Amino acid sequence: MRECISIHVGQAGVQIGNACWELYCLEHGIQPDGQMPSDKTIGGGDDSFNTFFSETGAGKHVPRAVFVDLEPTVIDEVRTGTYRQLFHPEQLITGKEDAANNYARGHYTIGKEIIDLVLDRIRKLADQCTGLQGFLVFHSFGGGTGSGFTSLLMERLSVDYGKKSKLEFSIYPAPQVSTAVVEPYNSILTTHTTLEHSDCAFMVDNEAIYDICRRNLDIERPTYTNLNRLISQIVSSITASLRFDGALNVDLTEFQTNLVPYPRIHFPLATYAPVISAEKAYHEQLSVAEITNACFEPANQMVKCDPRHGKYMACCLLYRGDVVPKDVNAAIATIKTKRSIQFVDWCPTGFKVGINYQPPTVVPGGDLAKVQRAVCMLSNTTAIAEAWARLDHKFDLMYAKRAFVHWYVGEGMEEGEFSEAREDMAALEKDYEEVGVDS
Amino acid sequence: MRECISIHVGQAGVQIGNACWELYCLEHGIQPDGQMPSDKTIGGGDDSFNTFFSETGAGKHVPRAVFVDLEPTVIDEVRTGTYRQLFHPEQLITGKEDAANNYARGHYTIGKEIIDLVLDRIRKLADQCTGLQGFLVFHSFGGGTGSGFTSLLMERLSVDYGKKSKLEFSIYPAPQVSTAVVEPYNSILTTHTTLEHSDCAFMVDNEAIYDICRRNLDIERPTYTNLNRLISQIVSSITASLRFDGALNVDLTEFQTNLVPYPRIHFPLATYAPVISAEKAYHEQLSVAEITNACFEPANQMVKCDPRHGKYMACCLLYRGDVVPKDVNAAIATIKTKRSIQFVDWCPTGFKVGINYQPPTVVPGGDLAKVQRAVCMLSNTTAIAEAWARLDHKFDLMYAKRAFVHWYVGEGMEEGEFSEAREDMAALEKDYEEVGVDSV
Amino acid sequence: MREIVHIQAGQCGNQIGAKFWEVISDEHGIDPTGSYHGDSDLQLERINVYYNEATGNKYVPRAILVDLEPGTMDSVRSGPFGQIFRPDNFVFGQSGAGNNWAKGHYTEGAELVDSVLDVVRKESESCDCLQGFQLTHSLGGGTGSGMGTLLISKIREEYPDRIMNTFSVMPSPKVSDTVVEPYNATLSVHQLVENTDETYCIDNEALYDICFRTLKLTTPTYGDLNHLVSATMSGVTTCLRFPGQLNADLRKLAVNMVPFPRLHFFMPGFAPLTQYRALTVPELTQQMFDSKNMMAACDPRHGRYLTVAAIFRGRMSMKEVDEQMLNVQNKNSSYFVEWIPNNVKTAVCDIPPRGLKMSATFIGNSTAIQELFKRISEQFTAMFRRKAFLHWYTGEGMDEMEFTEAESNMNDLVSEYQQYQDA
Amino acid sequence: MREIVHIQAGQCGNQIGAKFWEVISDEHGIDPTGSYHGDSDLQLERINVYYNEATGNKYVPRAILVDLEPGTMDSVRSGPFGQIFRPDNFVFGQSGAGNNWAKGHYTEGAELVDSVLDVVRKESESCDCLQGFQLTHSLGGGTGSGMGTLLISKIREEYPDRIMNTFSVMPSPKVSDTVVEPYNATLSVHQLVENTDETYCIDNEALYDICFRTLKLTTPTYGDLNHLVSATMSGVTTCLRFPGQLNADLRKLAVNMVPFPRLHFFMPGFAPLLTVPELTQQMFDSKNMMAACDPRHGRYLTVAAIFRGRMSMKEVDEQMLNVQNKNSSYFVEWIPNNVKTAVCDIPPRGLKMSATFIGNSTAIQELFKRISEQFTAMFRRKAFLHWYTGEGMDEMEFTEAESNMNDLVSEYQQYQDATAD
Ligand SMILES: Nc1nc2c(ncn2[C@@H]2O[C@H](COP(=O)(O)OP(=O)(O)OP(=O)(O)O)[C@@H](O)[C@H]2O)c(=O)[nH]1
Ligand SMILES: Nc1nc2c(ncn2[C@@H]2O[C@H](COP(=O)(O)OP(=O)(O)OP(=O)(O)O)[C@@H](O)[C@H]2O)c(=O)[nH]1
Ligand SMILES: COc1cc2c(c(OC)c1OC)-c1ccc(OC)c(=O)cc1[C@@H](NC(C)=O)CC2
Ligand SMILES: COc1cc2c(c(OC)c1OC)-c1ccc(OC)c(=O)cc1[C@@H](NC(C)=O)CC2
Ligand SMILES: Nc1nc2c(ncn2[C@@H]2O[C@H](COP(=O)(O)OP(=O)(O)O)[C@@H](O)[C@H]2O)c(=O)[nH]1
Ligand SMILES: Nc1nc2c(ncn2[C@@H]2O[C@H](COP(=O)(O)OP(=O)(O)O)[C@@H](O)[C@H]2O)c(=O)[nH]1
Ligand SMILES: [Ca+2]
Ligand SMILES: [Ca+2]
Ligand SMILES: [Mg+2]
Ligand SMILES: [Mg+2]
Ligand SMILES: [Mg+2]
Ligand SMILES: [Mg+2]
C-alpha cells in the first residue's frame, strides 16, 4: 500500500483543493466529520482509499493533504467551512502578507521565510506513510504565491524526497477570469523553474472551463465555485485510479509511463464529457460511442487548442460508470476512421483504456446533472504547444519594454532570470515542433 | 495669536493714530473708557480684535500701541481727549524739544535721548503677546521726527526683533497741504535708511488725499482732520483682515506674498472707493460693479501717478460689506476688457480678492457718507516710481547748490550721507524700470 | 489585516481628509460618535482597514491630523464628525507656514515633525499587519506641500517597505491663493516622484471646470470642489472597504498599475457627476472614459493609456458591465498600449454610495498626464526666469540650486511620459 | 516749554523793546500790573514763551534791560507797562557809550557784561526748555551796537546750540543821530554775519519814507517810526505766541528760512499802512518793505507770510499762488515751494486784518551797499578813527569789517545769478 500527499499552494490551489476533498469524501462515503461507516477496519486498513486518507483510533479519516497560502483569508474559509473538522489544524499553513502577484516576492522574499515550516508540516505527513509514492501539487500559474512559492517547494521536494514522483495540477491564466497584468511573467518564471521538478502536469485553462460553464451549464457569469466544481470533476477522474481498486494508473509513476515518453514534454491534455446541466430536468444520457466521440471535439478540452493539427504521443481513456469493454472497442473502431488521429511515427497508434464501474458522484446542489456514464481522455498532443505560444507572445510584448520588471528586480531577482526562463520556453516550443511537424 | 503692535511717530503719525483708534473702537463696539459689552471673555480671549487690543482684569481693552513724539503738544491732546482713558500713560511718550524739520536732529541729536525709553515700552508690549506678528509704523516723510526718529527706531527694531515684519504707513509730502522747504531732504534720507528694514510700505500722498477731499467730499479747504479720517478708512481696510474673522476673508500676510516680488519693490499703491458725500449718497446707490471700476480711475489713488503708463505686478481687491463673490467676479470680467490692465510677463494676470462682511463705519460728524459696501485695491505697479522721480528732482534742485545742507552738517551729518541716500533712490528708480522690461 | 494609517496635513489636506471620513463613516454606518448603526455585515467586514476599534463597540478613524496653524484644526474638531477623531492625534503648531514650501519643509515644519512621527509610530504599533500609509494634501501651499513631503520622507525612512499613497491636489490659477503655487508644487512633485508608490492627481483646474462647465455653478466654492474629491476618494477605496471577488490590497494595486517606477501618477475619474433619472450602464462607462469626467485637466486622447482600473458600484448586470467595457476598448484601441496585454480591469461592488443608484470610478495611468506637469512647469519658468518671489524661499535657507533641480527632475518626468507615448 | 529770553540794549533797544511789550501784552490780555484781564483762552496757551508765571497769576515779561547810561531805562520804568518789568532785570551803567562802538564792545561795555550775564543765566535756569534769545538793539552806535554784539558773542559761548535772533535797526541820515553811524553799522554787520541765526533788518531809512510819503507825515518822530517797528515785531512773532495750525519755533523757522549760514538777514514787510487780493499785493510791494530794497532788484530765496484776522483760508492760498505765478521771475528755481503762509485767528489791535512779510531776498544787498558806500567814504579819508583807535582798535579791524561786508553783498549776488537745469 502506497500513499499520496497533496499540497495546495495559493488561493487557486486551496480552493480547487477544497473542492476535490469535498468530492473525494462524497465518493468514498466519508462524512464531513471524518467518519466512514463503509470502513469496517477501525483505525487502519490497507484499502485503496487509504492512499489519500489516514485513520485515527477514533475511526476518523483525514486527507493526506497540506494547505499553504501566504495570507490567511482563503484558508480561514476552510478553517470555518463544512469540512473544518475534517482537517487537523497543522495541515493549514497561513502567512501574514501575500506575494502581491509578484513571482519574485513569493519565491525569494516571503518564500525563504516560510519554506522550512512547510517542509516540516509535510515531513509530519510523510512519516505516517509506509510507501509514499509522491505528491500532487495544486497551484495557479498567475498568483505570486501559486507561481513563486510553488517553484521553491518543487525544488526542495526533489532534494528531501528524491526518488518520489511529483505531479502538478496547474491553472493556466485567462483574462475572462480575474487575471492581473503581470500573470504572463509569473507563468513563464514558474514554468521554467519547475519544469525539471515535475514528472507530469495537467494544465487547466480558466478560459476553457469558463466557456464550458457558459455553453453546457448555461451560467451567464461563472464564479470560482462553478469553475472549481467542474475542475474537481476532471481531477477526480484522474486520481480515481489511485483511490479505487483497479489496474491502470495505480501509482504516480504510471502517469509518466503512460503519458510522458519525453521528459520535458510532460503536459497532457484533458478532455471530458458529458457536462450536462442539472437544470435540465430531462436529458437522454449519451451512449459510450457518443461520449467517446466527444473527446475529440475541441469544445470539451481543458485547454482551447486544435488537436487535429498536431500529433499524439499517447492517449488514455478513463470511463466511469456503466461501460462494457465491448462498447468501448466499437467506439474506438469508429472514431479512428471518422476523426483525424495522427500519431507520431515512433509511437504505437493505440489507446490504454480504463473502466471504473462506480459512476461520477455529484455535489448535491451543484451545477452538474448525474450521469450513468462519463469518460475522461488524457492525450499527449503537440497541439498543447499553442498555449505556450500564446503565453510566450504576451511575455514578449511586455518584456520588450521592460514593463513591470522593476517590481521583480526589487525583491532580489536578477533581470537575467527573465531572459533565462524565456529562453527555456523558446526551447520548449521547439521540442514540440521537432516532435510533431514534418517537411 | 498673531498680534500687531502699532507705533505712531511724530505729529502726522500721532494724529493719524488718533483717527485710526477712534475708528477701530467704533468698528468693534469699544467705548472710550475701554469697555466692550459684547466681549464675554473677561481679562483675555483669542478673538480677532485681540490682535490689536489687549485686555485687563476689569474688562478694559487697551490698544497695542505706542505713541512717540519729541515734543508734547500733539500727544497732550491724546492725553486730554475723548479716548484719554483708552491708553496707559506709559504708552504716550514725549520729549521737550523736537527735530525742527531736521532729520539729523530726529535720528541723532534729540532722538538718542529717548530711543532707549521707546524700545523699553515696546518690549513691555511685546511681552504681553503670545505670538507677536510684527509692527505697524505710522510716520511722515517730511518731519524731523517722522523721518529721523522713525529711521532710528526701525534700525533698532531690526536689532531687537530680527526679521520680524515691519510695515510702514508713510505720509508723502505735498506743497498744497503743509510742507516745509527741506522735506524732500528728510524724505530721501529716511526712505534710504529704512529701505532695508521695511517689509512693506503704504505711501499716502497728501496731494492725492487733498484732491479727493475736495472733488469727492465737497470740502473747499481740507484740514488735517479731513485728510486723516479718509486715511484711517484705508488703514482700516488693510488691517480689517487682521481684526475680523470671516469665511471669505484673506489675511494680509497672504496679500503680502503677492504684493512683494522682490525685497526692494515693496511699495503698493492703494485705492479706495467710494469716497462720496451724504448729499450725493442720498441719491446714488453704488454697486460692487461701480466701486470696483472706480479703483481703476487714476484720481482715486493714495499716490499721484498714472498706472496706464506702467505695468502691474499684483492686484488685490479687499471688499468689505454687502458684497458676494458672484458680483465681484462679474465686475472683474467687465474691467478686464474695458481697461488697460497691462501685467508684467513674469507673473499671472489674476486678481486676488478678500471679502470682509463687517460693513464700513464712519465717525460721527465725519464727511464720508455711510455706505453698504466699500473696496480697497492694493496694487503693485511700476507706475508708482513717478512719486520717487518727483521727490528726487526737488532733492536734486536744492542739493546741487547745497541749500540748507549746513543745518544737517551742523548736527553731525556728512555730505556723503546725502549722496549715498540719493544714489540709492537712483538704483530704486532703475529697479522699477527693469521689473517692467520683458523677459528674454 | 491590511490596516491603513491615514495622515492629512495642511488646510486642504484636512478639509478633503475630513470629508473623506464623513463619507466613508456614513457608508459603513458609523455615526459621528463612532457607534455602529448600520444594517449589513458587509459594512463591518473590512472596517478594520480604516477604523481602529475602541472598547464599547466604538470605531475610531486611524487618522492623524497635522497642520502648522491651529485654525482648520479647530474647524474640523467642531465640524460634523469632529468628535469621531481621536484627540491624541491632533498635532498642530502655532506659527503657520505662510504658503511657503520652505517654511513647511525646513524651518517651521521641522520643529513639529517629530511630534507627528510619534503619533504615526503609535498608530502603526497598533496594527496586526500594516499595509501602508495614505496622505491627503495640497501641493501649492506650505504645510501640505512641504511638511507633507517631509513626513512622506521621514515615514519612508522608518517604514521602508510599506506602501506610500497620496491624494495630491494640484494648483490652478482658476482657484488660486497666492502666486507662488507653481514654486511650492514643483518642489513637491520632485519629492513625490521619488518617495511615493501611488499618487492620485486631483487637479483643482479640472475640479473648477467640472463645477463651472458641467454642473452649471457660476461661483464654485471649496465646498463644491471637495464634494467631487470625496466621491472620487470613496470610489477609489471601495475594494479596500467592502468585500468582493477582489482579494487585493495597495501593493497588488501598485504592482499592476505602475509599469515603470517613476510613472505612478494616476488620473482619477467619476460618474455620474453630482438624481431621479437612473443612469444606464452604457452611460456610466461612456462618461467614465469621457475627457469631461477626469479629475485632472488632461485630454486622454493626447496620449496613451498604460493601465486602466474601473470600479462599478451598484446592483447591476455584471454581464452588461463587461460588454460595455470591451466596447469602449474596441472603440478606442488606438489610445491603449498594445505592449501591455489586457490592461483594463474592472471590479464591481454591490454597495452603492449614499445618494446614487450606481456609479463608476476611473483610475487611469496615462501618458496624457504630462500635460498637467507641463502646465505647472510653464508657470514655474515664467517666474523663475526672473527669480520673482524667490526671496520668500532664499530667506528660509534655500538656494536657487534647489529650484533648478526640481525643475529639471520634472522635465525628465515629462520626457519619460512622452517616451512611452510613441511606443 | 519753548521759552525765549528777551534782551534789549541801548536807547533804541529799550525804546522799541518797551513798545514790543506794550503791544503783545495788549494782545494777550496783560494789564500793566501783570494781571491777566483777557477774554480768550488762546491768549494764555503760549504765554510762557515771553512771560514767567509769578505767584497769584501775575505774568512778568522774561526780559532784560541793558544800557550804559541810566538816562533811558529811567524813562522805560515810567512809560505804561514799566512796573511789569522785573526790577532785578534792569542792568544799567553810568559813564555812557557816546555813540562809540569801541566803547560799547571793548572798554566800557566789558565792565558791565558780567552783570547782564548773571541775569541772562538766572532767567535761563528758570526755563523748562529754552528756545533761544531775541535782542532788540541798534547798529547806530554805542551800547546796543557794540555792547549788544558783545552780549550776543558772550551768550553764544554758553548756549552755542541755542538760537540767536536780533531785531537790528540800520542807520539812515534822514533820521541820523551822529556822523560816525556808518562806522558803527559796519562793525556790527561784521558780528551779525557770524554770531546770529536770524536777523530782521529794520531800516530807519524805510521807516522814514513810509511815514513821510505813505502816511504823509511831514515831521516824523521816533514815536512814529517805532510804531511801525512794533507792528512788524508783533507780526513776525505771531505764530510763536498763538496756537495756529503751524507748530513751529525759532529753530524751525531758521531751518526753512536760511538756505546758507551767512545769508540770514530778512526783509520785513507789513500791510496795510481791504481784501485778501490787495493785502497780498501790497505785501510784495517795495512801499511796504521795512528795508530800503526793491524786491524786484533781486530774487527771493525764501519767503514767509502770516495773515491775521478772519478770512478764508482758500482765498489766501489762491492769492498767494497767483502772486508767485505772476512774479515767477523773482523767485529762485533751485528752492522748490519756497513761499510759506500762515494764518492766525486773532488780528492785531485796531485792524480788521493785517499781513506780515518775512523775505530772504538777494535785493537786501542794496541795504548793505548803502552802508558800505558811506563807510568807505569816511574811512577812505581816515575821518574820526581816533575815536576808535583811542580805545585800542587798529585800522586792521576796520578793514576786515569792510572786506567781510563786501563778500556778504558778493554772496547775495552769486545766488541771485545762480541758475538751475
Ligand atoms: N480555476 C480557478 N482559478 C483561480 C481560482 N483562484 C484564483 N484563480 C486564478 O489564479 C490566478 C491568481 O492566482 P491566486 O491563487 O489568486 O494567487 P496566490 O497564489 O494567492 O498569489 P498572491 O495572491 O499573489 O500571493 C488568476 O489567473 C485567477 O484567475 C480558483 O478558485 N479557481
Ligand atoms: N495727512 C497728514 N499729514 C500730516 C499731519 N501732520 C503733519 N503732516 C505732514 O507731515 C509733514 C510734517 O511732519 P510732522 O509730522 O509735522 O513732523 P514731526 O514728525 O512732528 O517732526 P518735527 O516736529 O520736525 O520733529 C508735512 O508734510 C505735513 O503735511 C496729519 O495729521 N495728517
Ligand atoms: C484594492 O483595489 C484594487 C486592487 C487591484 C486592482 C484594482 O483595480 C480594479 C483595485 O481597485 C482599484 C487591479 C487593477 C489593475 C490591474 O491592471 C490593470 C490588475 O491587473 C490588477 C488589479 C487587481 N486584480 C484584478 C484581477 O482585478 C489587484 C489589484
Ligand atoms: C515761528 O513761526 C514760524 C515758524 C516757521 C515758519 C513760519 O513762517 C510761516 C513761521 O511764522 C513766521 C516757516 C516759514 C518758512 C518756510 O518756507 C521758507 C517753511 O518752509 C517753514 C515754516 C514753518 N512750516 C510751515 C509748514 O509753515 C515752520 C517754521
Ligand atoms: N480642492 C481644494 N483645494 C484647496 C482647498 N483649500 C486649499 N486648496 C488649494 O490648495 C492650495 C493652498 O494650499 P493650502 O492647503 O491652503 O495650504 P497649507 O495649509 O499650507 O497646506 C491652493 O492651490 C488652493 O486652491 C480645499 O478645501 N479644496
Ligand atoms: N526807530 C528808532 N531808532 C532809534 C531810536 N533811538 C535811537 N534810534 C536810532 O539808533 C541809532 C543810535 O543808537 P542809540 O540806541 O540811540 O544809541 P546807543 O544807546 O548808544 O546804542 C540812530 O540811528 C538813531 O536814529 C528809537 O527810539 N527808535
Ligand atoms: Ca480502514
Ligand atoms: Ca475678551
Ligand atoms: Mg493569495
Ligand atoms: Mg512735532
Ligand atoms: Mg490657504
Ligand atoms: Mg543816541
mmCIF file of C-alpha atoms and ligand atoms in Angstrom, chain A residues 36 38-47 49-50 53-55 59 61, ligand 7:
data_model
loop_
_atom_site.group_PDB
_atom_site.id
_atom_site.type_symbol
_atom_site.label_atom_id
_atom_site.label_comp_id
_atom_site.label_asym_id
_atom_site.label_seq_id
_atom_site.Cartn_x
_atom_site.Cartn_y
_atom_site.Cartn_z
ATOM 1 C CA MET A 36 -16.857 6.420 7.386
ATOM 2 C CA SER A 38 -18.311 1.945 4.804
ATOM 3 C CA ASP A 39 -14.966 1.265 6.517
ATOM 4 C CA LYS A 40 -15.067 -1.831 8.726
ATOM 5 C CA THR A 41 -11.403 -1.744 9.838
ATOM 6 C CA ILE A 42 -11.305 0.966 12.503
ATOM 7 C CA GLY A 43 -8.071 2.919 12.897
ATOM 8 C CA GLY A 44 -6.268 1.302 9.961
ATOM 9 C CA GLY A 45 -6.533 -0.993 6.977
ATOM 10 C CA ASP A 46 -4.884 -1.317 3.578
ATOM 11 C CA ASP A 47 -7.795 -0.307 1.352
ATOM 12 C CA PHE A 49 -8.819 4.842 -0.320
ATOM 13 C CA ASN A 50 -6.067 4.775 2.313
ATOM 14 C CA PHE A 53 -6.814 9.279 3.841
ATOM 15 C CA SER A 54 -5.258 8.151 7.096
ATOM 16 C CA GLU A 55 -7.248 6.963 10.097
ATOM 17 C CA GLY A 59 -12.372 5.979 13.329
ATOM 18 C CA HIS A 61 -10.352 9.633 8.130
HETATM 19 CA CA CA E 7 -9.919 1.336 7.368
#
